[PDB]
Design an enzyme around this catalytic site. Structure first.
Site, PDB file in Angstrom:
ATOM      1  N   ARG A   1       0.775  -1.247   0.000  1.00  0.00           N
ATOM      2  CA  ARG A   1       0.000   0.000   0.000  1.00  0.00           C
ATOM      3  C   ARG A   1       0.814   1.310   0.000  1.00  0.00           C
ATOM      4  NH1 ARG A   1      -5.258   2.334   1.176  1.00  0.00           N
ATOM      5  NH2 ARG A   1      -6.289   0.259   0.966  1.00  0.00           N
TER       6      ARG A   1
HETATM    7  O1  VO4 Z   1     -10.066   0.294   1.708  1.00  0.00           O
HETATM    8  V1  VO4 Z   1     -11.616   0.859   1.632  1.00  0.00           V
HETATM    9  O2  VO4 Z   1     -12.036  -0.336   3.535  1.00  0.00           O
HETATM   10  O3  VO4 Z   1     -11.697   2.205   2.614  1.00  0.00           O
HETATM   11  O4  VO4 Z   1     -12.860   0.236   0.780  1.00  0.00           O
END
Ligand code: VO4
Ligand SMILES: Nc1ncnc2c1ncn2[C@@H]1O[C@H](COP(=O)(O)OP(=O)(O)OP(=O)(O)O)[C@@H](O)[C@H]1O
Ligand SMILES: Nc1ncnc2c1ncn2[C@@H]1O[C@H](COP(=O)(O)OP(=O)(O)OP(=O)(O)O)[C@@H](O)[C@H]1O
Ligand SMILES: Nc1ncnc2c1ncn2[C@@H]1O[C@H](COP(=O)(O)OP(=O)(O)O)[C@@H](O)[C@H]1O
Ligand SMILES: Nc1ncnc2c1ncn2[C@@H]1O[C@H](COP(=O)(O)OP(=O)(O)O)[C@@H](O)[C@H]1O
Ligand code: VO4
Ligand code: VO4
Ligand SMILES: [Mg+2]
Ligand SMILES: [Mg+2]
Ligand SMILES: [Mg+2]
Ligand SMILES: [Mg+2]
Lengths: 471, 124, 374, 255, 311, 128
Positions: D245
């Site tokens: 991420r």
């Molecule tokens: O990553 V999201 O849980 O905010 O859809």
């Protein structure tokens, strides 16, 4: 000591609703967990205190039937939890959820009794020493190894081979065991408890004469209320405890289903004034399974090599019952129902049967590798068996398993009452040469089911003769 | 109830396919014992998809038997594959759709259970 | 009706089996006396007939010699239309069967408590025998419907529900009860009470809450599948998901001689009989373990309002386990099992007599039988 | 333990990665410092070992030169058998690893509130460093089991349940916490706290309520699949259902 | 295909019936009740003039409260009762959905001070369905040959609604939704359609055997249709059904408003020869759907002409 | 007004489904015990009561009419959900629109076998 205040330790029953009796004392409120004596009885009725409702009224959980109880009956305060007589003087006898003798052989003369609710062993009491212990069973001994003080857990989906196995572990292990043994039967059939009794007589384990008895039998089953199935597991544990500690010895403990310790709450929770949870259950199942299992362990004073059993409601491992339990058992064995069709017995599965004692240091580099390799071939095997090829094998890609699956299907002793097949076992001895061959390819070709209801590779050719194929 | 239905078809496909799987090698046995002496120097000096690549290329016991004898095995190989490359990649689905039952086995059990208490627990 | 089941010491060992009279049942799944055999099965599947045959089978016993070799019957009807019940009372009366039976009804109209208290009323019926040397057979027709009928009563007392309304003690509901049909030791009476709890299978699921709750107790469960039935496969018993549990103790030496292979030959055969449909090139002769399911299956399909005593059951099936009829294409097999008897009670009146003498298969009659079969 | 996570301005950017020492991990999935990396994974799959390696890796660092190139460790045990914990304390002690680590236990016996208050106790442990220039590595072994353990406490106070008993604020349960392991800007301290929340995968589902609740927060989730493991495929990480991420900022120029 | 069928049973049975008849419409459309009225006028059954009327119509439907749908079934039963008893006659009773007797409780239960159950329902559904259905029966004074109807909420037989009911009906007919796609009408299924009157003594040894044999072939048929062969038929193993499935798809009378197909019926008469052939093999070969929306074997060749295939 | 004054009319109840989402709200807040998916039990009498009001008028009463087409939200394709059953179990004739098709060009995209006219050929004039 068990002695109340200079004010009445007697309350009068104010409410009865099945297994829950509310009691009201005026001059001496009895703590939670205290064993209470119901007067006006024709037997022994103990109500374990559970809550302090206020208005100077407690809330108990009945240890036996609440039949005929009456709104006003006197209830006595013992002043201490349900305490059972602990000692060598309980060996060879059968106790119930209170320590009452149920094998009928009269009073259990003992030096003392211990409370069934005791503080679990502290951190600085634990022991890292994990010395191995062999059972000579296929998957069970080899795949997911076992150990001293280690907890065994058999996850069965209701009639898949959970209790049969335990009698068996008694066979190879219990008898030959040096040190004392225990068997708490929680929930399950009375039929079995009986046989188990007499079988333990037939084989001396329990001798009614001398004083050469090693097992202790604590029972509380099905024909009883949940307050009873709730604690029989505790009692048969309070037993094994006393032996390990105050008598420094490595005990064994056999719980026939230990999560009955939770059916219990599932039968008393809501009716206690609680808000339901997972499946209805209880907002306590975690601490429940917890607080209890954290007693059946080893320590700087002695060891308890135990063997439990955990049921799979509605065949769903997704139940927070078999589930939550896992985190306690030092070796897994989820017998599958879709496996009993296949006859594979025990129904231990080539996936969900873990262990925190399966490293090359203690099991073997050779052994733990082909184990990885057995489940490896097995994984893409689980896929191939349907995926790609679509059921029918043959297809292409010749790139053993069906063989190994028959290997670990040791039909053994406790399964004789079905087809004469007997004690298929032997402690590792000749696993070598054998199972390794299958995997690398060696010796692997014998006409499929031709090597089914047996284990040792030596019986591939000692059966090829039985069922021959040529000309 | 429901997944039981699509779990039936799989199981129904097993019997026929998974058994023929054994046949897949059997056909080979009933061939080589006689084919061999005629091969190499003995002379000279679903249903997969093998029985296809040869036919699409159009854009007296000698060759007609020698070829067919070797073509025999190239033809039944379809079974081989039909029972091994059709079942290797078709099982997972047994372990998959079985593994969500218990997902929606548990689910329903923990779905309707909500409603039962959604009214029960709150009253007066 | 609130008695607590005996216990470890009063009980002994399930021995001295009880004859259903249903070949497929007894032979395959033998029921011993003093035990609980669960007969689960969906709608329209035979649960009430089998139990009704099992009960009709005590006929010849309730008026003959050996008192101990008898059986009184307690039929509990829970939920059912009171016409279906009159269907049985009259029908059992036809075979005189009612003359030694007690039947109790909690038929729909009856308020929920009755459909509840009913089984606990029948338990006590038989307990008279199980506590007086005498033996008995109680049938709890639909404990399942009693499950539908228990939650009712508790919810109205405002006892917090749990799973599918089921009052939590849905276990103690059906543990408490079954646990009361036990085996009695000489030292206590020698009496017995055998119980077969009827259960409603929802499309095939045997592991539903209540069924788990019940199969998790009972020792031995005969599964009846609607899925089969019409196939002709009646009773239609699924092996791998149904057991005798008590082990070979129930099946006398006779069945321990013949039946010893029958049920587990089919335990893994559920694979091959689930494969053969597409074999071709495998282990050529693996066909034997297969030839042995089909032909036998047609001998394994008892079906009629009539029971074939133990020594007749020792007659026809044995002939198969000992593969002699074998090879012959099935179809007509039905006429063997039918005629072999009209042929047996017409000339072979001694062979059956060697089971009321030796009580097993003779070296002799093995040959004798082997001669009328060949 | 009831502190509110810093915010936009105190934080900066996940840089100066932290070495697990696990090839497959770092290389593939590099963990940067001051961030939350979720290690989900079913029973028997490696979650505690990996975290235990990741922690063992700071060895050579906790006695060498570059002070800033160090790492203190906070291991939180929630639920676990107090023997499994002694297994680690002793084992980490073997590699001397315990000499620079703090370990906290809420082992089964302990009443539900403890198994609850525990993580919020470890968070604060490290916050000492994340607020004093120093850095730290906290491991919340089984927040999942804390989920099993939270509902308990609330239901008994008669706080209406919602999903699977989970008190509704099952989010604020695990948002509130993770949101506390952040990156510290020079202008605020330069300190850090990295957190890897352990989670129990139910047969393979990563999207269960609580997991969603947790993966929906955390930045970077290492999935450990029991499905593989024995295959030899260990750690057994599923790509397509697991990410870093934070992006390539963690992985130094080398990776 | 639950209510269409009932009008139909009225057709063959109600009209020709000797003795009185009743029709309790519980829950369902008012539209139908109306038509049913006027159709019963068009065909004399209900005559507004003389006094030659045989049916009695009790209604309480949809546009009404549950206390009403709760008891309309009772009333239309209290009717049929009086006729059987105090007037000794074999009545007929037609309930258009009898479990509306339970939607009722499902709409009044909780709002009465009760704790919910299965699906929310009621801790009384059992006794409910019970106490009620145990009136619509025969006796030493007269008989009530009745015809009910039971709805399947959310298409789930797993509902304790269609479910609990089963134990009352002296013949089952679970019309399937996955069957209407197939057009098979009625949608009665070759599995879940039982009876406590299907023994050789009353139905036939010949008949009940090929019935066993029809569902037999059908069972391994349900498997084969997908299992082993994987959808596409042909494969191997030639070891009829698709035929028989078209046999029992009698499009009959009450379904005329769709495609002119009419009163496909006739009381057993020529089932003989016909259906038996299919199963043993005889006469079985006619180009598949060539024998689809019709029943009698006599129309295999009386249609082969309609759609011919040769040269 | 029309169905009672000879005149005719066409009413469209765009999303009764959303009214279902919107009914439970109101009842739960009055503390009327919920049942299925919160739906106040009388989720039937909710949509029976209504549709049952668009009827055909006989000469002898007026000859007027009111036709109603209740709009409903299909959840991925399920037509048998509680509320839909609740609604299809009433209405005479249901036109199913499938998102599954549409783009295919198959628009309106009507699934036959799971959609009917019910009233029969009476609607379709001799022409059709
Ligand atoms: O990553 V999201 O849980 O905010 O859809
Ligand atoms: N041996 C037999 N072979 C074929 N059919 C039989 C046989 N014995 C009984 N039958 C018929 O089989 C059915 C037997 O099961 P029955 O319906 O009585 O009980 P059940 O399905 O277990 O429960 P329920 O009465 O609720 O349906 C009856 O309809 C009966 O007429
Ligand atoms: N690199 C490795 N390769 C193969 N096995 C390992 C490796 N490292 C540790 N193990 C073994 O793998 C398992 C690691 O996971 P472990 O059981 O500790 O944690 P977990 O599965 O995430 O949670 P839990 O303790 O509840 O099972 C241990 O049983 C351990 O002995
Ligand atoms: N080792 C074994 N070999 C073959 N069959 C077995 C074995 N263990 C159990 N079974 C089969 O499974 C049934 C249930 O097993 P059991 O061990 O009694 O489980 P539990 O008592 O835990 O439910 C038995 O009745 C038997 O048919
Ligand atoms: N016998 C039949 N033949 C062909 N189609 C039918 C038949 N009966 C019903 N259908 C179809 O199914 C729809 C629903 O059937 P219906 O009998 O009105 O059931 P119910 O009124 O019980 O819901 C009809 O609109 C029609 O398309
Ligand atoms: O048979 V066991 O219900 O005790 O798993
Ligand atoms: O159309 V019916 O909802 O009345 O089954
Ligand atoms: Mg058991
Ligand atoms: Mg019955
Ligand atoms: Mg761990
Ligand atoms: Mg209708």
């Amino acid at each position: 000591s068990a002695a109340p205040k200079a004010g009445t330790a007697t309350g009068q029953i104010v409410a009865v609703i099945g297994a829950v009796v509310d009691v009201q004392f005026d001059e001496g409120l009895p703590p939670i967990l205290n064993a209470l004596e119901v007067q006006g009885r024709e037997s022994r009725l103990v109500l374990e205190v559970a809550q302090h409702l206020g208005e100077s009224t407690v809330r108990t959980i009945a240890m036996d039937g609440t039949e005929g109880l009456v709104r006003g009956q006197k209830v006595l305060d013992s002043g201490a939890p349900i305490k059972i007589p602990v000692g060598p003087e309980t060996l060879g006898r059968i106790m119930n959820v209170i320590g009452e003798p149920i094998d009928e052989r009269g009073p259990i003369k003992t030096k003392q009794f211990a409370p069934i609710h005791a503080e679990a062993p502290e951190f600085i009491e634990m022991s890292v020493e994990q010395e191995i212990l062999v059972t000579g069973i296929k998957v069970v001994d080899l795949l997911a190894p076992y150990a001293k003080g280690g907890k065994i857990g058999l996850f069965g989906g209701a009639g898949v081979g959970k209790t049969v196995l335990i009698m068996e572990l008694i066979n190879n292990v219990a008898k030959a065991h040096g040190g004392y043994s225990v068997f708490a039967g929680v929930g399950e059939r009375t039929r079995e408890g009986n046989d188990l009794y007499h079988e333990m007589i037939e084989s001396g384990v329990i001798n009614l004469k001398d004083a050469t008895s090693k097992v202790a039998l604590v029972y509380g089953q099905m024909n009883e209320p949940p307050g009873a199935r709730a604690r029989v597991a505790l009692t048969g544990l309070t037993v094994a405890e006393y032996f390990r500690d105050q008598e420094g010895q490595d005990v064994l403990l056999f719980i026939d289903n230990i999560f009955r310790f939770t059916q219990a709450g599932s039968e008393v929770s809501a009716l206690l004034g609680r808000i339901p949870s997972a499946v209805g259950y209880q907002p306590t199942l975690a601490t429940d399974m917890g607080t209890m299992q954290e007693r059946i362990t080893t320590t700087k004073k002695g060891s308890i090599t135990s063997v439990q059993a955990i049921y799979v409601p509605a065949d769903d491992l997704t139940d927070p019952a078999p589930a939550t339990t896992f985190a306690h058992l030092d070796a897994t064995t989820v017998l599958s129902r879709a496996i009993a069709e296949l006859g594979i017995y025990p129904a231990v599965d080539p996936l969900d049967s873990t262990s925190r004692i399966m490293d090359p240091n203690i099991v073997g580099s050779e052994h733990y590798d082909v184990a990885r390799g057995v489940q490896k071939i097995l994984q893409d095997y689980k896929s191939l068996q349907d995926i790609i090829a679509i059921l029918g094998m043959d297809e292409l890609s010749e790139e053993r398993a069906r063989k190994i699956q028959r290997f670990l299907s040791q039909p053994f002793q406790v399964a004789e009452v079905f087809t004469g097949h007997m004690g298929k076992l032997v402690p590792l001895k000749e696993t070598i040469k054998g199972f390794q061959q299958i995997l690398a390819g060696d010796y692997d070709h014998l006409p499929e089911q031709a090597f089914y209801m047996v284990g040792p590779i030596e019986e591939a050719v000692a059966k090829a003769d039985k069922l021959a194929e040529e000309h | 109830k429901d997944i039981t239905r699509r779990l039936k078809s799989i199981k129904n496909i097993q019997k026929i396919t998974k058994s023929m799987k054994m046949v897949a090698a059997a056909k080979y046995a009933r061939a080589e014992r006689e084919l061999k002496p005629a091969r190499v120097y003995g002379t000279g000096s679903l249903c997969g998809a093998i029985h296809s690549s040869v036919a699409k290329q159009m854009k007296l016991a000698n060759i007609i038997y020698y070829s067919l004898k070797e073509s025999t095995t190239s033809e039944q190989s379809a079974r081989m594959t039909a029972m091994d490359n059709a079942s290797k990649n078709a099982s997972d689905m047994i372990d998959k759709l079985t593994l969500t039952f218990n997902r929606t086995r548990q689910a329903v059990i923990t779905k309707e259970l909500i409603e039962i208490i959604s009214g029960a627990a709150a009253l007066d | 009706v609130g008695l607590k089941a005996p216990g470890i010491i009063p009980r002994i060992s399930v021995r001295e089996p009880m004859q259903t009279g249903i070949k497929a049942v007894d032979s395959l799944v033998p029921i011993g006396r003093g035990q609980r055999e669960l007969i689960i099965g969906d709608r329209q599947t035979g649960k009430t007939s089998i139990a009704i045959d099992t009960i009709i089978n005590q006929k010849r016993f309730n008026d003959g010699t050996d008192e101990k070799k008898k059986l009184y019957c307690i039929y509990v009807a829970i939920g059912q239309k009171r016409s279906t019940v009159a269907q049985l009372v009259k029908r059992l009366t036809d075979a005189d069967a009612m003359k030694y039976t007690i039947v109790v009804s909690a038929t729909a109209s009856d308020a929920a408590p009755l459909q509840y208290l009913a089984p606990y009323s029948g338990c006590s019926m038989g307990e008279y025998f199980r506590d007086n040397g005498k033996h008995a057979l109680i049938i709890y027709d639909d404990l399942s419907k009693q499950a539908v009928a228990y939650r009712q009563m508790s919810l109205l007392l405002r006892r917090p529900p749990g799973r599918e309304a089921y009052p939590g003690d849905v276990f103690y509901l059906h543990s408490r009860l079954l646990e009361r049909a036990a085996k009695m030791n000489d030292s206590f009476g020698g009496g017995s009470l055998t119980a077969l709890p009827v259960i409603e299978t929802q499309a095939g699921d045997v592991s539903a809450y209540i069924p788990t709750n019940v199969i998790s107790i009972t020792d031995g469960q005969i599964f009846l599948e609607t899925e089969l039935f019409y196939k002709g496969i009646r009773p239609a018993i699924n092996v791998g998901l149904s057991v005798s549990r008590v082990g070979s103790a129930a099946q006398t030496r006779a069945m321990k001689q013949v039946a010893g292979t029958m049920k587990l030959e089919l335990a893994q055969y559920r694979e091959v009989a689930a494969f053969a449909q597409f074999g071709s090139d495998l282990d050529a002769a693996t066909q034997q373990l297969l030839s042995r399911g089909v032909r036998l299956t047609e001998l394994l399909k008892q079906g009629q309002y009539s029971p074939m005593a133990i020594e007749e059951q020792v007659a026809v099936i044995y002939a198969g386990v000992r593969g002699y009829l074998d090879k012959l294409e099935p179809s007509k097999i039905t006429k063997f099992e039918s005629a072999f008897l009209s042929h047996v009670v017409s000339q072979h009146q001694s062979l059956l007599g060697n089971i009321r003498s030796d009580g097993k298969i003779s070296e002799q009659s093995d040959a004798k039988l082997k001669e009328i079969v060949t």
